[PDB]
Design an enzyme around this catalytic site. Structure first.
Site, PDB file in Angstrom:
ATOM      1  N   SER A 244      19.669  20.839  62.970  1.00  0.00           N
ATOM      2  CA  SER A 244      19.304  21.001  61.559  1.00  0.00           C
ATOM      3  C   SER A 244      17.982  20.292  61.232  1.00  0.00           C
ATOM      4  O   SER A 244      17.155  20.834  60.484  1.00  0.00           O
ATOM      5  CB  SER A 244      20.427  20.507  60.638  1.00  0.00           C
ATOM      6  OG  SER A 244      21.460  21.474  60.538  1.00  0.00           O
ATOM      7  N   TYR A 247      14.575  22.165  61.485  1.00  0.00           N
ATOM      8  CA  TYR A 247      14.207  23.063  60.376  1.00  0.00           C
ATOM      9  C   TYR A 247      13.546  22.368  59.177  1.00  0.00           C
ATOM     10  O   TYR A 247      13.098  23.051  58.249  1.00  0.00           O
ATOM     11  CB  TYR A 247      15.422  23.870  59.903  1.00  0.00           C
ATOM     12  CG  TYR A 247      15.920  24.830  60.950  1.00  0.00           C
ATOM     13  CD1 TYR A 247      15.337  26.093  61.107  1.00  0.00           C
ATOM     14  CD2 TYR A 247      16.965  24.480  61.796  1.00  0.00           C
ATOM     15  CE1 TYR A 247      15.789  26.978  62.079  1.00  0.00           C
ATOM     16  CE2 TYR A 247      17.426  25.356  62.771  1.00  0.00           C
ATOM     17  CZ  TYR A 247      16.838  26.603  62.908  1.00  0.00           C
ATOM     18  OH  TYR A 247      17.305  27.469  63.874  1.00  0.00           O
ATOM     19  N   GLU A 328      26.784  26.702  65.814  1.00  0.00           N
ATOM     20  CA  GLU A 328      26.120  27.290  64.680  1.00  0.00           C
ATOM     21  C   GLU A 328      27.198  27.917  63.819  1.00  0.00           C
ATOM     22  O   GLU A 328      28.083  28.597  64.346  1.00  0.00           O
ATOM     23  CB  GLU A 328      25.153  28.349  65.185  1.00  0.00           C
ATOM     24  CG  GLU A 328      24.043  28.680  64.226  1.00  0.00           C
ATOM     25  CD  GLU A 328      22.925  29.448  64.891  1.00  0.00           C
ATOM     26  OE1 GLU A 328      22.581  30.538  64.389  1.00  0.00           O
ATOM     27  OE2 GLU A 328      22.381  28.943  65.895  1.00  0.00           O
TER      28      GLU A 328
HETATM   29  C1  LIG Z   1      16.974  32.631  50.407  1.00  0.00           C
HETATM   30  C2  LIG Z   1      17.660  31.263  50.525  1.00  0.00           C
HETATM   31  N1  LIG Z   1      18.318  31.056  51.836  1.00  0.00           N
HETATM   32  C3  LIG Z   1      18.014  31.849  53.071  1.00  0.00           C
HETATM   33  C4  LIG Z   1      17.915  30.826  54.172  1.00  0.00           C
HETATM   34  N2  LIG Z   1      19.242  30.169  54.325  1.00  0.00           N
HETATM   35  C5  LIG Z   1      19.860  29.908  55.508  1.00  0.00           C
HETATM   36  O1  LIG Z   1      20.974  29.378  55.535  1.00  0.00           O
HETATM   37  C6  LIG Z   1      19.301  30.229  56.752  1.00  0.00           C
HETATM   38  C7  LIG Z   1      18.765  29.219  57.563  1.00  0.00           C
HETATM   39  C8  LIG Z   1      18.233  29.499  58.838  1.00  0.00           C
HETATM   40  C9  LIG Z   1      17.639  28.510  59.688  1.00  0.00           C
HETATM   41  N3  LIG Z   1      18.384  27.217  59.676  1.00  0.00           N
HETATM   42  C10 LIG Z   1      17.943  26.263  58.815  1.00  0.00           C
HETATM   43  O2  LIG Z   1      16.982  26.454  58.067  1.00  0.00           O
HETATM   44  N4  LIG Z   1      18.573  25.022  58.733  1.00  0.00           N
HETATM   45  C11 LIG Z   1      19.659  24.720  59.538  1.00  0.00           C
HETATM   46  O3  LIG Z   1      20.169  23.601  59.425  1.00  0.00           O
HETATM   47  C12 LIG Z   1      20.115  25.694  60.434  1.00  0.00           C
HETATM   48  C13 LIG Z   1      21.216  25.421  61.261  1.00  0.00           C
HETATM   49  C14 LIG Z   1      21.683  26.374  62.166  1.00  0.00           C
HETATM   50  C15 LIG Z   1      21.049  27.605  62.240  1.00  0.00           C
HETATM   51  C16 LIG Z   1      19.959  27.893  61.416  1.00  0.00           C
HETATM   52  C17 LIG Z   1      19.457  26.949  60.495  1.00  0.00           C
HETATM   53  C18 LIG Z   1      18.245  30.836  59.264  1.00  0.00           C
HETATM   54  C19 LIG Z   1      18.787  31.839  58.463  1.00  0.00           C
HETATM   55  C20 LIG Z   1      19.319  31.541  57.214  1.00  0.00           C
HETATM   56  F1  LIG Z   1      19.835  32.504  56.460  1.00  0.00           F
HETATM   57  C21 LIG Z   1      19.958  29.766  53.110  1.00  0.00           C
HETATM   58  C22 LIG Z   1      19.242  30.060  51.922  1.00  0.00           C
HETATM   59  O4  LIG Z   1      19.506  29.407  50.905  1.00  0.00           O
END
Ligand SMILES: CCN1CCN(C(=O)c2cc(Cn3c(=O)[nH]c(=O)c4ccccc43)ccc2F)CC1=O
Length: 351
Positions: A244, A247, A328
């Site tokens: 995490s 990111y 994940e």
């Molecule tokens: C448009 C707002 N949005 C879209 C991005 N989102 C996500 O949860 C998201 C986040 C990621 C990337 N990612 C990330 O950004 N943080 C993590 O801790 C993570 C952990 C495991 C796998 C991916 C992670 C990839 C695809 C997604 F959909 C939540 C969100 O609020």
């Protein structure tokens, strides 16, 4: 102005996440032209339109020419202007190009919310803007005491779940916030007693957090290309802190990062070893688990407010031909998340 009676940690947090120059710095990292598309001109319908062109590029990639791709690629750059001068910009012709621009537009959504809160509402010079901006988040943020039991558990979760493959840095916890978004506990009520509830990490860059704390963690809209996300359009969490933490997109050029600890109602997990671009779970499943090669030790699980915290040291999982080094977790209803903490982190880069 009155000078604000919030604790110092909470004040520094508000400055951080509402920083306007940081939003601009993030935009240029995605090669966006602030001359043509400044922070003020940014809007949801432009971002959604861009998503849709990205969906058309997805379509042409899935069915195989560089002639037709050119036109779709150019229409994308029309909607979200990029900084290339008198150019010929780089062609968007592969799955990586789709994933990369999807992750940008994800971030732009969160920046648009942050900025709209900033330029919406009222202007009182007799109030400290720290308090003003704090109220716009509709979130109760309290500082956790370093000696408390919940602080000890959280620091141990950070300490025990840093992966060897992410050892280019290590993490100090600066501040631990207990957070409570308005209406979220109410929204979580149907899932509050569901089996397999787990306290999991979610990292994001600091310029997303005003958006996250106001709107919660959300699902990417219908317009977004489902191929751009490994397990489709949901909310993604990890049980290893460093996964995490990556990111956050810290660097030697800015390693103060923010990370969430949320309660995720996983329930019956649909376990997968490889990418699966779904827009709905199979019947009876409440989440997806991307199976890691490594996993925190199941024997070392600990409870915090009746929620499992997988804070064991990473061990082998006994899963063979998987895409994922680490676990994940994905949920596809926003009601299955209740955000419990926010950590401010100190990245010690050793490179
Ligand atoms: C448009 C707002 N949005 C879209 C991005 N989102 C996500 O949860 C998201 C986040 C990621 C990337 N990612 C990330 O950004 N943080 C993590 O801790 C993570 C952990 C495991 C796998 C991916 C992670 C990839 C695809 C997604 F959909 C939540 C969100 O609020």
């Amino acid at each position: 102005h009155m000078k604000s009676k919030l604790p110092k940690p909470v004040q520094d947090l508000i400055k951080m996440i509402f920083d306007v120059e940081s939003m601009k710095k993030a935009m240029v990292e995605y090669e966006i032209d602030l001359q043509k598309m400044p922070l003020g001109k940014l809007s949801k319908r432009q971002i959604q339109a861009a998503y849709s062109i990205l969906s058309e590029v997805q379509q042409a990639v899935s069915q195989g020419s560089d002639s037709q791709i050119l036109d779709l690629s150019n229409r994308f750059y029309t909607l979200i202007p990029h900084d290339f001068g008198m150019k010929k910009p780089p062609l968007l012709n592969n799955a990586d190009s789709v994933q990369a621009k999807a992750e940008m537009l994800d971030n732009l959504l969160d920046i648009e919310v942050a900025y709209s809160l900033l330029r919406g509402g009222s202007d009182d010079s007799s109030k400290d803007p720290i308090d003003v901006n704090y109220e716009k988040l509709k979130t109760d943020i309290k500082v956790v005491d370093r000696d408390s039991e919940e602080a000890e558990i959280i620091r141990k979760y950070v300490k025990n779940t840093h992966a060897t493959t992410h050892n280019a840095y290590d993490l100090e916890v600066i501040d631990i916030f207990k957070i409570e978004r308005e209406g979220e506990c109410q929204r979580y009520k149907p899932f509050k007693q569901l089996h397999n509830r787990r306290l999991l990490w979610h990292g994001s860059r600091t310029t997303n957090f005003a958006g996250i704390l106001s709107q919660g963690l959300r699902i990417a809209p219908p317009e977004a290309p489902v191929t751009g996300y490994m397990f489709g359009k949901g909310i993604y969490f990890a049980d290893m802190v460093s996964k995490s933490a990556n990111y956050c997109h810290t660097s030697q050029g800015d390693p103060i990062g923010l990370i969430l600890l949320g309660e995720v109602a996983l329930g019956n997990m649909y376990e997968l070893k490889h990418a699966s671009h779904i827009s709905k779970l199979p019947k009876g499943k409440h989440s997806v688990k991307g199976l890691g090669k490594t996993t925190p030790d199941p024997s070392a699980n600990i409870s915090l407010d009746g929620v499992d915290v997988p804070l064991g040291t990473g061990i082998s999982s006994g899963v063979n031909d998987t895409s994922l080094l680490y676990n994940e977790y994905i949920v596809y209803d926003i009601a299955q998340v209740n955000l419990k903490y926010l950590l401010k982190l100190k990245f010690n880069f050793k490179t």
